[PDB]
Design a protein around this ligand. Sequence first.
Ligand SMILES: Nc1ncnc2c1ncn2[C@@H]1O[C@H](COP(=O)(O)OP(=O)(O)CP(=O)(O)O)[C@@H](O)[C@H]1O
Ligand code: ICS
Ligand code: CLF
Ligand code: CLF
Ligand code: SF4
Ligand SMILES: [Fe+3]
Ligand SMILES: [Fe+3]
Ligand SMILES: [Mg+2]
Lengths: 477, 271, 522, 522
Amino acid sequence: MSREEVESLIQEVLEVYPEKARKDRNKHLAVNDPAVTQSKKCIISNKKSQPGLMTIRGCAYAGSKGVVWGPIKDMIHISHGPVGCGQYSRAGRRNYYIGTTGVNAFVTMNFTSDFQEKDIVFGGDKKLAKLIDEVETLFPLNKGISVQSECPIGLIGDDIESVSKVKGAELSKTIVPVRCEGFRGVSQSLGHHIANDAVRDWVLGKRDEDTTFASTPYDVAIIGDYNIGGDAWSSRILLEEMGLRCVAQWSGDGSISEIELTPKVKLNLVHCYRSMNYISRHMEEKYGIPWMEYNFFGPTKTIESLRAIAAKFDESIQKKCEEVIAKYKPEWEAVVAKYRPRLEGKRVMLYIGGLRPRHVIGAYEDLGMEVVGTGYEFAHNDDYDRTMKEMGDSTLLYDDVTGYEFEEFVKRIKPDLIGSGIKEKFIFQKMGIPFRQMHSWDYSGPYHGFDGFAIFARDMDMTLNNPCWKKLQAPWE
Amino acid sequence: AMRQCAIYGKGGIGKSTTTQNLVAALAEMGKKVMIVGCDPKADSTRLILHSKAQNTIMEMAAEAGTVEDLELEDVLKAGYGGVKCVESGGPEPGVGCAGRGVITAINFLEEEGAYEDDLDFVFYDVLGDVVCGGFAMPIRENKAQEIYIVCSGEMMAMYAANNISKGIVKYANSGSVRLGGLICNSRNTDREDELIIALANKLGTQMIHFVPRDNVVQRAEIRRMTVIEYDPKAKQADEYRALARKVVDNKLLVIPNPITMDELEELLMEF
Amino acid sequence: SQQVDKIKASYPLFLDQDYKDMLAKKRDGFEEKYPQDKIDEVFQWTTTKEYQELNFQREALTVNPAKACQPLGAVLCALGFEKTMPYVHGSQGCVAYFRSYFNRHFREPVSCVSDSMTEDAAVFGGQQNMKDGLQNCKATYKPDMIAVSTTCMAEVIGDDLNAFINNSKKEGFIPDEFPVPFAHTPSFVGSHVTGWDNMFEGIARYFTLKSMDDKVVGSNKKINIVPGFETYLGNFRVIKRMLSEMGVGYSLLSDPEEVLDTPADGQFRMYAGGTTQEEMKDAPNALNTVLLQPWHLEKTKKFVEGTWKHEVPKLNIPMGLDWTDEFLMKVSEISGQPIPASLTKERGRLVDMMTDSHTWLHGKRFALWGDPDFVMGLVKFLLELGCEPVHILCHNGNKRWKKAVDAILAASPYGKNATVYIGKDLWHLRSLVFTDKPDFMIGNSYGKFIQRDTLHKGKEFEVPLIRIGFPIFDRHHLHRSTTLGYEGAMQILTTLVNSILERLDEETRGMQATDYNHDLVR
Amino acid sequence: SQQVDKIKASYPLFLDQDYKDMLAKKRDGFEEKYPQDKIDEVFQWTTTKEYQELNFQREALTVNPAKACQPLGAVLCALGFEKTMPYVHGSQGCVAYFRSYFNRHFREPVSCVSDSMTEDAAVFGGQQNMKDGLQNCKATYKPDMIAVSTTCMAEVIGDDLNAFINNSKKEGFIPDEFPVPFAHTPSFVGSHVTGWDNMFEGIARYFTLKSMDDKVVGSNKKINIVPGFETYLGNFRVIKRMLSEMGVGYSLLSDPEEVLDTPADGQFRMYAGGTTQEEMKDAPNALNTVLLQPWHLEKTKKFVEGTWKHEVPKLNIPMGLDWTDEFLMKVSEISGQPIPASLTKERGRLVDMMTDSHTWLHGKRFALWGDPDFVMGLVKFLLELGCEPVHILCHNGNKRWKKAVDAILAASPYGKNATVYIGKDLWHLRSLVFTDKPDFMIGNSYGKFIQRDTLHKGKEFEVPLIRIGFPIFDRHHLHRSTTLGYEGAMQILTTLVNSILERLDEETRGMQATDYNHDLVR
Ligand SMILES: Nc1ncnc2c1ncn2[C@@H]1O[C@H](COP(=O)(O)OP(=O)(O)CP(=O)(O)O)[C@@H](O)[C@H]1O
Ligand code: ICS
Ligand code: CLF
Ligand code: CLF
Ligand code: SF4
Ligand SMILES: [Fe+3]
Ligand SMILES: [Fe+3]
Ligand SMILES: [Mg+2]
């Protein structure tokens, strides 16, 4: 608070770095101006991380396997390479699904080619071919396979496209080779892009010349909702109560047939712009399908989204929209009446991935809370363009923040609440600052939609006002 | 006081032949020597063994599943003069990662105590295309302390010398590996000896020996032998004994000062 | 919908009729799902001996592994040294996973850095990343030591850690005397425990290799203890407690017990406690060195015997009654200190518990998995208790270890129905608990999906999971437990017999059906 | 029938068809059993509000009490003194029960004698039984001390313990200086905890009343600790560990932890450890006396304040965070020793655990019962965790205690739905968990029949029991646990949060039905 003072804090924190890192990090920290429309004038993003500074970022494999492909429930996803990557990512993300796991669905499982030294030296294409035969033997109801490359696959030049084509034809199966070796790009983000392109090239066009699906004018798809703790379900219920038909959700609780049917819809509803804008633009260019961003975090944004979406159709849908909004009005008003008095005026700092750092702000504001700092691991400048108008003047923005920076900023701004990831959580709890996981929802949720808002409000209150936070100082000190 | 030595140089310049003929001569003198092939085509010991099949570390590992299941006496063999021979091995061309094969094989040798026993010399025979970190495994700390670069009076072969010296510098500055000299494997070019002596001084090393072009080297090779074994009294055999003697008594170990591709062009015009 | 005074999270929210209806429409409309009867038929097939034979014929596919990769272990090793920053040379995705993995098991901060090698560093090598990374990390987080390991990309391309680190020093990116020990930790060799061994031997070498000349075995009158890969805080603690109780001078080499358990008192402590650099430098002067987990400390053992010249005792992990006895007698022998009355009494209290609970333990059948030393200690103690190990799995075990465990099994009439599996995974283990059903599984949190699968066949086929091992993500604070020594044996015994009794109560809780055996007193 | 290689005990043997058919014929032939429909209808009625009303109108019938009688507590107190034989003047049936009751909880021998008053001793009084009993007991079991309490028959007829013991000495049955402290312990007053208070005060009186003239408060520089009725061995141990950690001189008065935990090493030890007679004699020279369980140590307090002249601190039981803090600070003030870094760290580790686990504990609803101090300490800690105690039952509580627990509840927004019940039993509690269902019960093994009843109404009505208290008969070695101090608070927190997570896993284990929420990580 106060622009000169925030700029002072930034320069103080930067003093610890060597010149090269100091010069770089300076470009990734900003004091917000809601007026500014071109964030390139104010902050730089989507650049390589400085070595040794404890970035919070992950890799392209996390962005491809962990985020986009992993949730698709009736396919089997191969972590191709050594045993590490697939094991750390096994069931760490709560992309919820309905299925019979190990039989027709496979999301929580870890399939891997478990590369050994002889596989590196002699290459793994023969092992991958045999692995695919064994998958078909032991999991006959799988509806397709993806091959998610880890680092060594990309270095040694294994030809996984050729293997996917030959085995695909031999077994009449969709097999999707993904070059998401983790050293590509600079973060999870290039993994999104690589994964989108793999969907485009290997899956999405499968029904291009099939007309057996009966489409309606109210057909939509939810693009970029990974159903964390059931988020997509509590969004999908609203769209369908509004009279729309949700043919697909990408990719939380998603199925390969939903993906193949998606080119038949009338409108693509994009929640996560960062991870799925690529295939959204593709679908408009090839199929003529328009897309629109929406936001189902909190009642103000949900209501605004529902009306914006409904205006895209006809009067019948707009009538149903207002009827949905009327139905849920006393529910979220009771949530606000109960929890807003407990949270009013509290100040929050966020640090998340590529969407939620701006997207959840409205929900905090519906509870009378103030977001005084936000930032992203891997957003691009078109994300910051959308962020600066959502944030207050002289709030702090930080891109690819370091462990050191984030801590120093928190010590000076002294938020009442911090919303970030598992690698941040236990640091700030020890400083006595209430912390909410804003990736995993701290094993709670959903937070999307009206039903989600009630849980979000409950969770923020339970943590911010918990009796544990008064107990950190021993009485004799 | 075992001396570890690594042989580098332009592809096709005569590294493997020179190394094996050198080693035969050392063994003829009574030196105990091990040759480590660091090339996936595994042809570094072909002329020393030439009797019975050679199995490579990587091939034997694949058959056994991992390197941990491998035993040293399965891959380490003795040939002419009791010279001990072992090959890294690696994939056929165009697949896998031969660089990692060399890393793995030398790690194995280290772990299994190959460098115990009282050897006077170890030579690493490396391929010409040093395209990654793995092929510089032989010049890491605790490996080769002396590099000999095989060259000739041909442009490509001097540019290779210089460029290899470039690559050597990061290891030389950080450890004890040093350039021991240039070995001129002659291509019968005009005033070749003077010219290589000249390149040596710009780099800061020496031309330790001039090896004549002699087709007996190729006749021995066709019979899978060194000249020392094939024709112990040939002129060329005496050349290799001469080379071996210099290597035994050599104390000149320096850090290379590579020159510009311009200085090299200067050298070749001025001759 | 939500009632504001009884808000529903995902469970049981999505059991509401309108959500159930919506999910049914999604499935039938767009998922083109196999019919339920087909799903049931395939599920039943996956429980058969026919499927099991196909399953065990796998040569290329791994499903649900029960191991992780080397640098995870290197990081844990490095965390055990005073003010030491783990540093993994290579790709940053790895480090985000290492930290998260450990965050979830310990519920604590885990500090580790990367030098963020990208595509162009793969191609040109990571020398510049090491230079900037070391300078940056030192300036920013101010460690007294940086312990460097590698990710697999840096191992494929053969980045020479030694050279890169020395060039960083020679070019003035970090002070020459600043300690930067290193180890190559290739993920495509061995497992996380191999990484721990490699890191430790690297650190030991760094501090002792060049200064052996003034060392004298036995001159500091201590015993070195090397714990290996250890994720139970209680295990570090119980070893220190017993040695102190005996009055034995000791030095625990790699000791992350403080940094993994800092107080929440208003400040974040990036570092706490740990083995000091002086302790490592002085380690060759110890009477001897004891390795708590010998089956993954083989590189360390070679270095300690060959360079420090310590006559490392041939000791099993100190788990269960016999092997804790042997550990204490060997420590007594080395140090000259008698085993004190207090530890003798503790032993007798474990024996008392064994006599008290033996009737409920007798003949109970277990499947179990985990790391090699942990698994063999658990097998040994199960035999002592009169239990039957039946399915013993160690995904990262080797042939020599398997023969050693077979020999332990053969030495007891309770080991007659047991088989030891190496290189097999939890999908293999799944088949085993269907075709040859045990009473319980002892394993880590990944076992919960097997329990779920067995219940779906039927309540009478369910195999309950008992959580002992690593990682444990779905219970809180179990990382504070002990598995070593008499104290760990008491905790394990208590967990086993009460798992048995908890299940028997569940099976006898049926009013006027099974509750004739719902005894108050057991 | 039996298959010899898989022998069946009562469960599941009697599920065999031929036994099932036999039991049907017995029922139908000869039991004149109410029809199953009538049984179902009455069962359902017992779960209702209308039944609860009738239930809470009881003035004369007690059903499933949650208390025992005075001499039980007198025996436990006596067991805490060195080489002391508890001796219960009166009827021998009592002692068989006292011993068996403790045998089953501790799984240890329990030594106690009777003087076996029969019907003619009821009429003529038990003076001869006391004379012969004391002489026999001393000659046969060779105690250094005999501590005498009473059964209810000796209380009705007014046997004068003091006179009977003194005549035994005057007539030569036992030596004059042989210590025989006594207390009247009527089973129809108060409960087992009152018997503990009475026995302790009797022993304290015996060793100090006549020798006060030379005593000087504070001259031995120790603090006396009086634990009260305590059946967790960890609680004796944690108090001693913490005082030793602070460097505080102390004297634990009544200390049964050794004799209730002897080793199995080939000899039976009838006596072990315990408070010495010298410690009791020297107790008035202490700085002060701390009572760990003040709500059942009121008679002891009166004696210690009035005769020893100690300014006994007004402290709650040291359970949970605040009251352990208050205990440590008072000890620090009395002794002059500071609270050391180690205990400050331990406190912060507890706070860390509360921060780590607070989201699963928040708002969770509990019914609980037990003795007064234990129950209020548990209520206090639940409030600190953000849990909602809902049904708080203390069968042996009194009106003053209830008002104090009500004050604690009122002071926290988490107490707003709580009711405190005194004089009510487990049949009352059963109605409460049907009509106002909590998420869990915290109590002793008698809670299992309530869990069974709730499950019978339906899985969604089941209230799982969390076993904390006394007695625990149907699990093994829980008596080794700790409930006091930070250590006890950590154990309780861990138990509570993992009970919550265990139940959630059970509720989400349904394949393709509820397992969308069967998270690996919690
Ligand atoms: N002094 C000499 N006179 C005549 N021929 C010679 C010679 N030295 C080597 N040769 C021949 O040159 C050819 C290449 O020799 P060599 O195989 O030793 O080269 P090299 O080891 O540098 C190939 P690479 O780069 O693939 O590792 C062989 O046929 C060898 O017989
Ligand atoms: S996909 Fe992205 S880091 Fe858009 S990689 Fe990440 S389930 Fe975050 S801010 Mo984890 S761009 Fe989703 C995300 Fe946001 S895994 Fe989840 S929470 S809305
Ligand atoms: S960026 Fe994998 S965790 Fe690593 S050392 Fe290799 S096995 Fe182990 Fe991304 S794709 Fe994966 S997670 Fe890293 S390796 Fe690369
Ligand atoms: S011979 Fe009862 S246990 Fe006793 S002090 Fe009275 S309440 Fe307590 Fe038999 S009938 Fe009973 S058990 Fe004894 S009292 Fe008599
Ligand atoms: S260049 Fe070297 S490291 Fe890279 S893949 Fe080829 S052989 Fe392996
Ligand atoms: Fe924690
Ligand atoms: Fe016992
Ligand atoms: Mg060659």
